[PDB]
Each structure stands twice: as C-alpha cells, then as structure tokens.
Design a protein around this ligand. Structure first.
Ligand SMILES: O=P(O)(O)O[C@H]1[C@H](O)[C@@H](OP(=O)(O)O)[C@H](OP(=O)(O)O)[C@@H](OP(=O)(O)O)[C@H]1O
Ligand SMILES: Nc1ncnc2c1ncn2[C@@H]1O[C@H](COP(=O)(O)OP(=O)(O)O)[C@@H](O)[C@H]1O
Ligand SMILES: [Mn+2]
Length: 265
C-alpha cells in the first residue's frame, strides 16, 4: 500500500476510509504522539493517499518489528458475512494443510476452501494472539534481511526469544522500548479515542538502530471502528461475539511483561 512522497521525511499510504477517519481523530487525541503524524490526503495516479510521517526517517539503518495487537484479528461483521453469504478462499485453505494437515475439516478439504473468520481464528490460535493478545508478524533488518516466518510463534518464551534476537543485546534499546511501551499504555488508558473504538488489526511498530535510537508507534487503523453511541470497551476482558472486545490491553500488558523479563535475563 506504500509509495514515496515528494517531501523529505514523509511516506504515502493508499487511502482507506476507516483509516483516514481514525488518523484525523488521533491527531487531536491523547494518542497523537503514539502514532505517525497524519498531514492530510493527496492525489497521485488519480489515486488518493494518506500523507504520513515516515517513522524510519531519523534512524540510521533501522531494524523494524511489527507486532499485530489484539486477541481478535477480524471484525464481528465478518462473522455475520460468513454465515449469511460465505466466500470460500482457496488460498486461506492451502496454508492450513502446510502448517497443520489435520487442521481443515473433512468439508473444508472437499471445498479446498475456508471462510475468513475461520482462517483468522486458526492463525490466532497457532500463534500467540489468542493466549497473549498479540503476535509478531515480521522483522525487517538493517542487514537487508526480512522475515515473516512467525506463524507458530506462540509461547511466552518463543516470543521472548524473537525479541532477544531482534535487540541483539542492546540494553539501551530494550530500556527505551520498555519506557515507550509504559508511556503508551498510560496514554491508551486515558485516551478518548481508545475507549470509544474497537481496535482490530493494528500493530505496534518497533524501530531501533545501531546508535541506540528506539521508538514504538501504533499503526494500521484500517479495521478500527467506533462503538455504537456512548458504549466503551475495557480492552482487557475476553471477546465474546456481541461485546466487540479486542483484548488490545491484555496484549500490551503481556508484551510489557515479556520485555521486562527479557531485560532481567
Ligand atoms: O497474515 P495472513 O495470515 O496472510 O492473513 C492476512 C492478514 O491477516 C491481513 O491482515 P494484514 O493486512 O494486517 O496482514 C488480512 O487483511 P485485512 O486488513 O483485509 O483483514 C488478510 O485478509 P484478506 O485481505 O481478506 O485476504 C489476511 O489474508
Ligand atoms: N508511517 C510509517 N512510516 C514508515 N514505515 C511504515 C509506516 N507505516 C507502516 N510502515 C511499514 O509498512 C508496514 C505495513 O504497514 P501497514 O499500516 O500495516 O500497511 P498494510 O495494512 O497495507 O500492510 C509496517 O509493518 C512497516 O514496516
Ligand atoms: Mn497490516
């Protein structure tokens, strides 16, 4: 979804309505500093783009880790959609045989295809999302090396070992990350945006360099949606269809915990 901007320090992202609505709101919220600066929409190839701060500007050869936050990674309306009018996905099927050949049902196999919520619930359960409320999605590196090979990274200790490898023994980065996550947690807990929105499919982006510069920002507000009038979430309690709960803060709590653990090793 990304394209280079004509201005130093910025990046363009393909405009989507929910995300655009979210960024505008966030620029006036307690979370303003916890997300990339949003500077408006622009037109390029007859196409609209979010004009964003490039979070990597300011770092020297940045290392990047994307952590998808939440116990739930799809909207409830996708559950409704799958029950009234399912669109079978043959792609979402072939991976399941790869990760776990006994995972698809006898019927899914005959279909060679799976619904969206089903595929997503299974991803949640073989990774750490269901149990810890986040998961690692990818790492991008200063050495050029990228990896998304984290589909079965699930246990507390597997997660810890990915971060241990990502920070490469830099106590100052790790310290800075933890200070940033504590301050983000504090912000989320008083944010008016956060208590009025179900935050699904967003990530915390960790960015550090060999100069010990470290930052974290929330990104990807494409599936982040306002709750019905005057309704709010606690972002910790289990999701049950109907309640719209995302377990975002369960995730954050556990992530902080794992980092604090790592720092004491
Ligand atoms: O990560 P894998 O296991 O491949 O599954 C992907 C991701 O969950 C996507 O989220 P993200 O883009 O954050 O990676 C999701 O996009 P949505 O944001 O549209 O839910 C895709 O759904 P489809 O777009 O329906 O394929 C789904 O196929
Ligand atoms: N504002 C930003 N500045 C620099 N890099 C970004 C920024 N936002 C996202 N990225 C990079 O691009 C990746 C995907 O961003 P994301 O918002 O999840 O887009 P999408 O849902 O279209 O994949 C991130 O994991 C990160 O590596
Ligand atoms: Mn994404």
């Amino acid at each position: 979804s990304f394209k280079a901007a004509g201005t130093s320090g910025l990046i363009l992202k393909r405009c989507s309505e929910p995300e655009r609505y979210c960024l505008a709101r966030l620029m006036a919220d307690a979370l303003r500093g916890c997300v990339p600066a949003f500077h408006g929409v622009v037109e390029r190839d007859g196409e609209s783009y979010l004009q964003l701060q490039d979070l990597l500007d300011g770092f020297d050869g940045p290392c990047v880790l994307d952590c998808k936050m939440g116990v739930r990674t799809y909207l409830e309306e996708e559950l409704t959609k799958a029950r009234e009018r399912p669109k079978l996905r043959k792609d979402m099927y072939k991976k399941m045989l790869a990760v776990d050949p006994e995972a698809p049902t006898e019927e899914e196999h005959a279909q060679r295809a799976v619904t969206k919520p089903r595929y997503m619930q299974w991803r949640e359960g073989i990774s750490s999302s269901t149990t810890l409320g986040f998961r690692i999605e990818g790492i991008k590196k200063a050495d050029g090396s990228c990896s998304t090979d984290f589909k079965t990274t699930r246990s507390r200790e597997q997660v810890l070992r990915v971060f241990e490898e990502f920070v490469q023994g830099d106590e100052e980065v790790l310290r800075r990350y933890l200070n940033r996550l504590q301050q983000i947690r504090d912000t989320l807990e008083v944010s008016e945006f956060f208590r009025r929105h179900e935050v699904i499919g967003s990530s915390l982006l960790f960015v550090h360099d060999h100069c010990h510069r470290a930052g974290v920002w929330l990104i990807d507000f494409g599936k982040t949606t306002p709750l019905p009038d005057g309704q709010i979430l606690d972002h910790r309690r289990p999701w049950e269809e109907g309640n719209r709960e995302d377990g975002y803060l369960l995730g954050l709590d556990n992530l902080i915990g794992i980092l604090a653990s790592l720092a004491e090793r």
